[PDB]
Nucleic acid binder design. Structure first.
Ligand SMILES: [Mg+2]
Ligand SMILES: [Mg+2]
Ligand SMILES: [Mg+2]
Ligand SMILES: [Mg+2]
Ligand SMILES: [Mg+2]
Ligand SMILES: [Mg+2]
Ligand SMILES: [Mg+2]
Ligand SMILES: [Mg+2]
Ligand SMILES: [Mg+2]
Ligand SMILES: [Mg+2]
Ligand SMILES: [Mg+2]
Ligand SMILES: [Mg+2]
Ligand SMILES: [Mg+2]
Ligand SMILES: [Mg+2]
Ligand SMILES: [Mg+2]
Ligand SMILES: [Mg+2]
Ligand SMILES: [Mg+2]
Ligand SMILES: [Mg+2]
Ligand SMILES: [Mg+2]
Ligand SMILES: [Mg+2]
Ligand SMILES: [Mg+2]
Ligand SMILES: [Mg+2]
Ligand SMILES: [Mg+2]
Ligand SMILES: [Mg+2]
Ligand SMILES: [Mg+2]
Ligand SMILES: [Mg+2]
Ligand SMILES: [Mg+2]
Ligand SMILES: [Mg+2]
Ligand SMILES: [Mg+2]
Ligand SMILES: [Mg+2]
Ligand SMILES: [Mg+2]
Ligand SMILES: [Mg+2]
Ligand SMILES: [Mg+2]
Ligand SMILES: [Mg+2]
Ligand SMILES: [Mg+2]
Ligand SMILES: [Mg+2]
Ligand SMILES: [Mg+2]
Ligand SMILES: [Mg+2]
Ligand SMILES: [Mg+2]
Ligand SMILES: [Mg+2]
Ligand SMILES: [Mg+2]
Ligand SMILES: [Mg+2]
Ligand SMILES: [Mg+2]
Ligand SMILES: [Mg+2]
Ligand SMILES: [Mg+2]
Ligand SMILES: [Mg+2]
Ligand SMILES: [Mg+2]
Ligand SMILES: [Mg+2]
Ligand SMILES: [Mg+2]
Ligand SMILES: [Mg+2]
Ligand SMILES: [Mg+2]
Ligand SMILES: [Mg+2]
Ligand SMILES: [Mg+2]
Ligand SMILES: [Mg+2]
Ligand SMILES: [Mg+2]
Ligand SMILES: [Mg+2]
Ligand SMILES: [Mg+2]
Ligand SMILES: [Mg+2]
Ligand SMILES: [Mg+2]
Ligand SMILES: [Mg+2]
Ligand SMILES: [Mg+2]
Ligand SMILES: [Mg+2]
Ligand SMILES: [Mg+2]
Ligand SMILES: [Mg+2]
Ligand SMILES: [Mg+2]
Ligand SMILES: [Mg+2]
Ligand SMILES: [Mg+2]
Ligand SMILES: [Mg+2]
Ligand SMILES: [Mg+2]
Ligand SMILES: [Mg+2]
Ligand SMILES: [Mg+2]
Ligand SMILES: [Mg+2]
Ligand SMILES: [Mg+2]
Ligand SMILES: [Mg+2]
Ligand SMILES: [Mg+2]
Ligand SMILES: [Mg+2]
Ligand SMILES: [Mg+2]
Ligand SMILES: [Mg+2]
Ligand SMILES: [Mg+2]
Ligand SMILES: [Mg+2]
Ligand SMILES: [Mg+2]
Ligand SMILES: [Mg+2]
Ligand SMILES: [Mg+2]
Ligand SMILES: [Mg+2]
Ligand SMILES: [Mg+2]
Ligand SMILES: [Mg+2]
Ligand SMILES: [Mg+2]
Ligand SMILES: [Mg+2]
Ligand SMILES: [Mg+2]
Ligand SMILES: [Mg+2]
Ligand SMILES: [Mg+2]
Ligand SMILES: [Mg+2]
Ligand SMILES: [Mg+2]
Ligand SMILES: [Mg+2]
Ligand SMILES: [Mg+2]
Ligand SMILES: [Mg+2]
Ligand SMILES: [Mg+2]
Ligand SMILES: [Mg+2]
Ligand SMILES: [Mg+2]
Ligand SMILES: [Mg+2]
Ligand SMILES: [Mg+2]
Ligand SMILES: [Mg+2]
Ligand SMILES: [Mg+2]
Ligand SMILES: [Mg+2]
Ligand SMILES: [Mg+2]
Ligand SMILES: [Mg+2]
Ligand SMILES: [Mg+2]
Ligand SMILES: [Mg+2]
Ligand SMILES: [Mg+2]
Ligand SMILES: [Mg+2]
Ligand SMILES: [Mg+2]
Ligand SMILES: [Mg+2]
Ligand SMILES: [Mg+2]
Ligand SMILES: [Mg+2]
Ligand SMILES: [Mg+2]
Ligand SMILES: [Mg+2]
Ligand SMILES: [Mg+2]
Ligand SMILES: [Mg+2]
Ligand SMILES: [Zn+2]
Lengths: 83, 124, 208, 99, 104, 138
RNA sequence: GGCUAAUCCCCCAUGUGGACCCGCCCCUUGGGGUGUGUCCAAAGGGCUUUGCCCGCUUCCGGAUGGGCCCGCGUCCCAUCAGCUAGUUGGUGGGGUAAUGGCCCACCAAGGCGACGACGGGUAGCCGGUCUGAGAGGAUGGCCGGCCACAGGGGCACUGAGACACGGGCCCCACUCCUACGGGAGGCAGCAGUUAGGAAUCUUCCGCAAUGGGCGCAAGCCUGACGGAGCGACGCCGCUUGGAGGAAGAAGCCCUUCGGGGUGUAAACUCCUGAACCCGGGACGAAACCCCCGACGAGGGGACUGACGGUACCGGGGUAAUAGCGCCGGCCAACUCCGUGCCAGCAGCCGCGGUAAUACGGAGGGCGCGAGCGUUACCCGGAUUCACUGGGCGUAAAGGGCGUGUAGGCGGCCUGGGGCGUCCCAUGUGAAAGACCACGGCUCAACCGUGGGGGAGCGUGGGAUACGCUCAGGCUAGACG
């Protein structure tokens, strides 16, 4: 079951996640399907979050399942807003 | 050789023989002395050159040189063998490492002491 | 620990004033006046024709001892210059002269480069409003270098700046002595520096 | 010691039993049917063949047979039965076969 | 695309099968010259319509036997017994590669 | 027979110029002519002309040298210092356009044969095509 | 041996749909539609039970993950030259999700090999990595992708998936228990022990973060993982002070006894203030959940930190580790003394039998500096296997000579084809790495974001000089 989730990237005490579409069975930092975004929790730059929503929407549409935190980010980026 | 010939035959890569069967090339090898003997060098040199026959952890019996001014080796002494040859002695392919195992560092050695394996004096 | 042992002896080996002491090294004490030859027993014996290697070596050493930088740093910095688009010699000089400690010397906050290194390391120096204690920090054009406000009252800072009244800094720099701040306007290029170094020789020294 | 799903093993045995049994059923029936078609016995040949078909599909229902497994078995069955009937012919009950 | 290859039929001798000899050219990866190499493919000939000497097209197919992966797509030109002959002579040349020799 | 007519011609020219002949005769082929035409446009030769010799066609190539010289050895600088085959039967050489050699910092030339015709490296680059690398000349 | 529940197992029904045989149609390998016959469904639970939630069944499609197949590429020995009976193919079966000699019956007699079959040796492959001007050589640790394995050998079972590391059966070796009948076990998981070795860590912390499994959820599990510890193993950053301070102390060294050197070095003066003490003290954490809405969207609100009282900030504050190799040439740095072919040094040439800049100490000097050396191994230099880029009269190297097979190579002119060759477009060339730009940790190492590049291969289009090919012609080669 294909997922949308975080993969850990920056160095020690420097977490940077790629927001990622991948089969759930994969190791988290291993080969993913597509990268639809990125997240820096320490907000060290003016843009600490980016998400490509036309693509996030695609993957949701075909049945990708977000992690709660993935979901959280996507919502922040308005993937979910219907107005 | 014609290009056709190179195509049919090709160059031969040139393999390199090893100067040191310390077996699996290891930087060093442990062994025990069989003989501690002195031996006499070749033509334009005269000396009593200090040497030790070692049985090795490799399953090899080799001949080693015992560098430095004087040595504590003898008989069943355990020892570390480092490779590199004494030129003017036939068949000595390796050196013994002073300061490791049963071979002590050279007594009263002020200049380069890391070779010869001796520690730093206190200035008196 | 990059160098830190007697200096005017290097002034003496390289056969040129290296200005490692600030004051003194101007007056008639520098030991270049008063016996300008190599140190040690044989310094006054007749010199022998230097190998190409010896030439290149000593040129490199000269340039390095000038900045007080280590060899590891010197070399990395050089490899950097060689990689960058544009003439390695010039670029290398610019990268060197771009060090924070160096800039603090050039600006006259510190009398020497060693003193500048200390001034920086003890954080009496601020880059762009923020403290910087690392001597190897690279000052980019536009950056403003100043003395941190709490350290503005230090006897040596007051002094050094007082003697900076009516003196001009390099053309790639500008100094306001009243606010104790500089600015690094441009990368200096070989002709801005009077350095007694043929850098072609240095380039040729690593070409080996 | 004692990692507690050897429960899985036990179950595996039970299922092994069920599957084995269903399979046996299917095979013995299939042979019965074909062997009947051999004899131009077509009425009860197709009768049995029909039972067999059912058993096969019913197997496919769970993990015993599952999908193309059954489909293949059914095909080979019907092919053999019809092939045997003609060569003496007369598809009496014509139960399972398209006309 | 299912690969198509072109070859000469060097073997009649099986049932419903022909052996198709297929040349290939390419620059040597180092020495640069154009070298010519070749491979025999067993191909499916169900109607046994393809004869010795035929130049045919061979098409990548669903596996048929162990080592039959191709079918015969079409005939290109009928009979070239020169190509066959070359093959045969090369084979016969093996006769003396070993402990001694016969005629050249 | 003659295994490499192009090499043969290049060599006839070399050989002839090294003794300072005014001209040499190469046997005639259209391809040879196209090569000559490049040379003669490029200044390496005075030119050439079709010529019959014992009833057979040839290309008479008119050689060109420098001023006479001083000191011992008055012999002139050659206009063709170097003329050399690259692609030969037995190793053929094809460059893509990104791989067209630049001969002697542009003071020399390479001559490619392309599907747009026989070109110099400059011509070929401007024309945006590669080809067989025939010879280099400087 | 006995009782018993269910989302456990079975029987009939309903047949949306689907499976199979036969026919028909379109399509073309077993794809899609259709007709008749036969065959096939389900499971219930929770709630505020009057309607929602959690599920169940059949089917079609999607998404992801995989199986199988083909072209091409992928080390040494030819002192391995012939290999092969399921062998190679056919018909028919069997088996499987599925093609297949995968397996079996029968039939044919084939299949492979000098373009290196068969045999032997070594070896996980790759992105990449090291080196190199490049071509090339070498490598494949960590990170990512694939394969394979789980004491050795076989085998299946259960499943969507395994022929399953912490599942099962059997044989073998080993360890342990043993009432001698018989049993137990499998760290190539995290730590840790032991052995071998020149040599390779803590039986630590945490579920806070990211990820995973089950659960309606609350929540539970997770030696994945986030961390900390140990080791200069690597890289990067940093300290051992800074300014002054004698024609220049003492000591030690050299001396032509006039002096020269260590040396602004020290002492000393003054300034700064690593360490250290005090105070404050993190980001990484907003979702899951609560509120309004409609358990949505939207809005709003609260809980949670192993690392850690850590990083960091503020105040205070002491001049406070330096070593290692070398100084005959290559190769940067020279003198004194001791030794006398000894003791020794040594990478190569070499040095040492009385002046030793080559041994040993000292003074001095050169190089690097929390390192400096040594050994091992890879590339380099080595254009010393020569594609780039070498050679064979006498240095190694023309086969004793021919005939010719395979193969390699091929004159002039014209035409068709467009395989080589060249050009355009497109797809692919993951991520990481490399390159460039901008950025985040005070810098950097490290990291983030973006951009560019890229051989090769697929597909479409185009060019025709050269090479190929087919067709025709010529006569300068060749033969007559
Ligand atoms: Mg997976
Ligand atoms: Mg935002
Ligand atoms: Mg949506
Ligand atoms: Mg001697
Ligand atoms: Mg440069
Ligand atoms: Mg300027
Ligand atoms: Mg200066
Ligand atoms: Mg269990
Ligand atoms: Mg259970
Ligand atoms: Mg039975
Ligand atoms: Mg089938
Ligand atoms: Mg052909
Ligand atoms: Mg036949
Ligand atoms: Mg078959
Ligand atoms: Mg066909
Ligand atoms: Mg044979
Ligand atoms: Mg024989
Ligand atoms: Mg003439
Ligand atoms: Mg003309
Ligand atoms: Mg020439
Ligand atoms: Mg070439
Ligand atoms: Mg190409
Ligand atoms: Mg250039
Ligand atoms: Mg019972
Ligand atoms: Mg009952
Ligand atoms: Mg219906
Ligand atoms: Mg029913
Ligand atoms: Mg059920
Ligand atoms: Mg029921
Ligand atoms: Mg209910
Ligand atoms: Mg797929
Ligand atoms: Mg057999
Ligand atoms: Mg058989
Ligand atoms: Mg079959
Ligand atoms: Mg077989
Ligand atoms: Mg072949
Ligand atoms: Mg083999
Ligand atoms: Mg192996
Ligand atoms: Mg290997
Ligand atoms: Mg490199
Ligand atoms: Mg390089
Ligand atoms: Mg090489
Ligand atoms: Mg390379
Ligand atoms: Mg490899
Ligand atoms: Mg490992
Ligand atoms: Mg790995
Ligand atoms: Mg195994
Ligand atoms: Mg084991
Ligand atoms: Mg065993
Ligand atoms: Mg086993
Ligand atoms: Mg399951
Ligand atoms: Mg099953
Ligand atoms: Mg298991
Ligand atoms: Mg097992
Ligand atoms: Mg396995
Ligand atoms: Mg285990
Ligand atoms: Mg398991
Ligand atoms: Mg058991
Ligand atoms: Mg066991
Ligand atoms: Mg363990
Ligand atoms: Mg245990
Ligand atoms: Mg041990
Ligand atoms: Mg560890
Ligand atoms: Mg714990
Ligand atoms: Mg968690
Ligand atoms: Mg989770
Ligand atoms: Mg547990
Ligand atoms: Mg860990
Ligand atoms: Mg001082
Ligand atoms: Mg004194
Ligand atoms: Mg001293
Ligand atoms: Mg004195
Ligand atoms: Mg104070
Ligand atoms: Mg927090
Ligand atoms: Mg917070
Ligand atoms: Mg939680
Ligand atoms: Mg509510
Ligand atoms: Mg909300
Ligand atoms: Mg402080
Ligand atoms: Mg203070
Ligand atoms: Mg002190
Ligand atoms: Mg010498
Ligand atoms: Mg050197
Ligand atoms: Mg020298
Ligand atoms: Mg003596
Ligand atoms: Mg020495
Ligand atoms: Mg050595
Ligand atoms: Mg004496
Ligand atoms: Mg003496
Ligand atoms: Mg002497
Ligand atoms: Mg000496
Ligand atoms: Mg020496
Ligand atoms: Mg000495
Ligand atoms: Mg360091
Ligand atoms: Mg080498
Ligand atoms: Mg080099
Ligand atoms: Mg080279
Ligand atoms: Mg050699
Ligand atoms: Mg060559
Ligand atoms: Mg040579
Ligand atoms: Mg001779
Ligand atoms: Mg000879
Ligand atoms: Mg001869
Ligand atoms: Mg002979
Ligand atoms: Mg002949
Ligand atoms: Mg021939
Ligand atoms: Mg030919
Ligand atoms: Mg021709
Ligand atoms: Mg044509
Ligand atoms: Mg083409
Ligand atoms: Mg890439
Ligand atoms: Mg920055
Ligand atoms: Mg590449
Ligand atoms: Mg392409
Ligand atoms: Mg194309
Ligand atoms: Mg045309
Ligand atoms: Mg003709
Ligand atoms: Mg005649
Ligand atoms: Zn000075």
């Amino acid at each position: 079951m294909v997922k949308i989730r975080l993969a850990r990237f920056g160095s020690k005490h420097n977490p940077h996640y790629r927001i990622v579409v991948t089969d759930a069975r994969r190791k988290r930092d291993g080969k993913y399907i597509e990268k639809i975004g990125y997240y820096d929790p320490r907000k060290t730059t003016p843009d600490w979050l980016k998400v490509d929503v036309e693509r996030a929407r695609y993957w949701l549409s075909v049945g990708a399942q977000p992690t709660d935190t993935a979901r959280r980010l996507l919502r922040q980026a308005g993937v979910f807003r219907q107005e | 050789p014609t290009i056709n010939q190179l195509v049919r035959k090709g160059r031969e890569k040139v393999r390199k023989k090893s100067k040191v069967p310390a077996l699996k090339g290891a930087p060093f090898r442990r062994g025990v002395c069989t003989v501690v003997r002195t031996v006499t060098p070749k033509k334009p040199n005269s000396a009593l050159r200090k040497v030790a026959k070692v049985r090795l952890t490799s399953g090899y019996e080799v001949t080693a040189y015992i560098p430095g001014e004087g040595h504590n080796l003898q008989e069943h002494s355990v020892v570390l063998i480092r490779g590199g040859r004494v030129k003017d002695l036939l068949g000595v392919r390796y050196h013994i490492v002073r300061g490791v195992y049963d071979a002590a560092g050279v007594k009263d050695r002020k200049k380069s002491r890391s070779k010869y394996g001796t520690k730093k004096p206190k200035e008196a | 620990g990059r160098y830190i042992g007697p200096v005017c002896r290097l002034c003496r080996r390289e056969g040129v004033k290296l200005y490692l002491k600030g004051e003194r090294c101007y007056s008639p004490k520098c030991a270049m006046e008063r016996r300008p030859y190599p140190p040690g027993q044989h310094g006054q014996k007749r010199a022998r024709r230097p190998s190409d290697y010896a030439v290149r070596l000593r040129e490199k050493q000269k340039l390095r001892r000038i900045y007080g930088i280590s060899e590891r740093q010197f070399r990395n910095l050089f490899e950097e210059a060689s990689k960058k688009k544009g003439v390695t010699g010039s670029v290398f000089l610019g990268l060197l002269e771009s060090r924070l400690d160096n800039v603090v010397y050039r600006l006259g906050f510190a009398v020497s480069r060693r003193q500048a290194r200390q001034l920086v390391r003890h954080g009496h120096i601020t880059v762009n409003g923020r403290r910087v204690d690392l001597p190897s920090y690279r000052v980019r054009p536009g950056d403003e270098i100043a003395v941190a406000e709490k350290s503005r009252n230090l006897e040596l800072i007051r002094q050094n700046l007082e003697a900076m009244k009516g003196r001009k800094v390099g053309p790639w720099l500008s100094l306001d002595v009243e606010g104790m701040k500089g600015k690094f306007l441009r990368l200096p290029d070989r002709e801005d520096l009077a350095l007694p170094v043929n850098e072609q020789l240095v380039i040729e020294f690593y070409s080996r | 010691r004692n990692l507690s799903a050897l429960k899985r093993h036990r179950q595996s045995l039970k299922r092994r039993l069920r599957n084995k049994a269903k399979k046996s059923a299917i095979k013995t029936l299939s042979k019965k049917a074909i062997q009947l078609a051999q004899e131009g016995k077509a009425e009860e040949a197709l009768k049995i063949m029909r039972k067999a078909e059912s058993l096969i599909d019913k197997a496919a229902k769970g993990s015993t047979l599952h999908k193309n497994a059954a489909a293949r078995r059914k095909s080979r069955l019907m092919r053999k039965v019809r092939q045997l009937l003609e060569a003496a012919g007369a598809p009496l009950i014509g139960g399972g076969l398209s006309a | 695309p299912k690969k198509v290859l072109t070859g000469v039929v060097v073997s009649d001798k099986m049932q419903k099968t022909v052996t198709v000899l297929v040349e290939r050219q390419f620059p040597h990866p180092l020495y640069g010259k154009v070298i010519k190499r070749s491979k025999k493919y067993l191909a499916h000939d169900p109607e046994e319509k393809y004869k010795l000497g035929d130049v045919v097209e061979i098409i990548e197919s669903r596996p048929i036997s162990k080592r039959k992966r191709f079918r015969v797509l079409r005939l290109v030109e009928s009979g070239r017994m020169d190509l066959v002959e070359k093959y045969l002579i090369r084979r016969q040349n093996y006769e003396s590669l070993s402990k001694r020799g016969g005629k050249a | 027979m003659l295994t490499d007519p192009i090499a043969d011609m290049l060599t006839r020219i070399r050989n002839a110029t090294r003794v300072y002949k005014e001209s040499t005769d190469v046997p005639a082929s259209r391809f040879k002519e196209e090569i000559l035409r490049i040379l003669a446009r490029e200044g390496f030769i005075k030119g050439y002309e079709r010529v019959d010799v014992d009833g057979k066609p040839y290309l008479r190539v008119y050689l060109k040298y420098g001023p006479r010289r001083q000191g011992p050895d008055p012999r002139p600088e050659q206009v063709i210092h170097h003329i050399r085959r690259i692609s030969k039967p037995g190793r053929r050489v094809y460059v893509g356009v990104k791989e067209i050699p630049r001969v002697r910092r542009g003071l020399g030339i390479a001559i490619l044969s392309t599907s747009k015709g026989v070109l110099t490296d400059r011509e070929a680059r401007k024309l945006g095509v590669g080809g067989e690398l025939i010879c280099e000349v400087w």
